[PDB]
């Protein structure tokens, strides 16, 4: 199936994920913020370019990741490598830790805070830390088959008494309608993310929630890119990142599509930034640079191609 363009307005565009999720959205966020022009959101992800000059468990385990070059190349880069950092100005950035997360960690969180805190307005971001949570995704329900928010193992979607996706979502656009908590008025389309929308290290077929009201173009629609982490990619776990995290909910009853890019377990190794080289069986967004040196910069493999699937599906304003 081809993907769809739909009366989205591009300049209502955003993008979130969890961990390496959380790093590809900022990774997306400060390279292509042009794109991402309302805002972003980031899930117990980290500073944006963290692994390209010091080892990327640095930038994990809780650990304080340096962030004096992330930061200097986003300055050096604006407007080449990446889009103007002035962009970051204004932009609505949500940021998110559990208080008990030992594999990213608040200390790592923290660091993305400070860096982004060189570029962006203050009163336009909202960091926020769930006290108790580990490395999961935060919802408030219990989705089927989730983990306890105390246990950090598959599918890391849990109840953690804290609508994520919905505070996400209403800091990066303010105000939204309640959610549906009940029957989605809309579907789960699938795609093929082939040719420009697709790249080493992405599964062969992506997919997007779209609701009701978006289905027919009558009605202009807002687009939020939700990325999965590692291991929680349909791959490894079917529809339960699509359909648990919560988004759809929010998105259903306010005329906005969610974009599902996937990645796909790669068990070939490839030289990274530093330290040598390493596998990608887990399925994870590249953030350390399994596909090229420019993993975090415009033409970055995977971020092209999910920026390809956005630019698609904007096509149809009207
Ligand atoms: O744990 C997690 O999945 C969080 C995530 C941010 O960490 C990673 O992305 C780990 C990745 C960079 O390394 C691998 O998973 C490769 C594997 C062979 O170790
Ligand atoms: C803060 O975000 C809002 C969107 O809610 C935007 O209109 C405004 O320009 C931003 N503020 C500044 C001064 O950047």
Redesign the pocket.
């Given at each position: 199936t081809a993907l769809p363009a739909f009366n989205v307005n591009p300049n209502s565009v955003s993008v979130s994920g969890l961990?390496?999720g959380?790093?590809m959205a900022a990774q997306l966020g400060v390279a292509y913020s042009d794109v991402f022009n309302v805002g972003f959101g980031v899930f117990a992800?980290?500073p944006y370019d963290c692994?390209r000059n010091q080892y990327?468990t640095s930038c994990?385990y809780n650990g304080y990741p340096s962030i004096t070059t992330p930061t200097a190349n986003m300055k050096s880069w604006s407007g080449n490598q990446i889009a103007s950092v002035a962009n970051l100005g204004q932009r609505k950035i949500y940021m998110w830790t559990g208080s008990s997360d030992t594999?990213?960690g608040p200390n790592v969180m923290n660091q993305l805070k400070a860096q982004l805190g060189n570029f962006d307005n203050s009163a336009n971001v909202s960091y926020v830390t769930t006290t108790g949570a580990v490395?999961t995704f935060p919802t408030d329900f219990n989705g089927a088959g989730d983990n306890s928010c105390s246990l950090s193992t598959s599918p890391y979607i849990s109840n953690c008494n804290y609508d994520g996706a919905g505070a996400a979502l209403k800091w990066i656009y303010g105000s939204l309608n309640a959610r549906n908590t009940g029957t989605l008025s809309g579907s789960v389309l699938s795609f093929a993310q082939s040719g420009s929308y697709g790249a080493n290290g992405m599964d062969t077929t992506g997919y997007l929630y779209v609701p009701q009201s978006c289905a027919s173009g009558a009605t202009v629609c807002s687009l939020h890119v939700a990325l999965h982490?590692?291991?929680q990619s349909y791959s490894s776990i079917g529809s339960r990142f699509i359909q648990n995290t919560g988004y759809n909910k929010w998105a259903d009853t306010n005329n906005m599509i969610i974009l599902y890019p996937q990645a796909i377990p790669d068990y070939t190794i490839h030289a990274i930034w530093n330290g040598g080289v390493?596998?990608?069986?887990?399925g994870?967004w590249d953030?350390?640079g399994w596909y090229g040196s420019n993993a975090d910069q415009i033409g970055g493999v995977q971020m092209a191609a999910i920026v390809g699937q956005v630019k698609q599906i904007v096509s149809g304003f009207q």
């Open positions: 961990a390496s959380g790093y992800g980290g692994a990327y994990m594999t990213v490395h982490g590692c291991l390493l596998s990608n069986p887990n994870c953030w350390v």
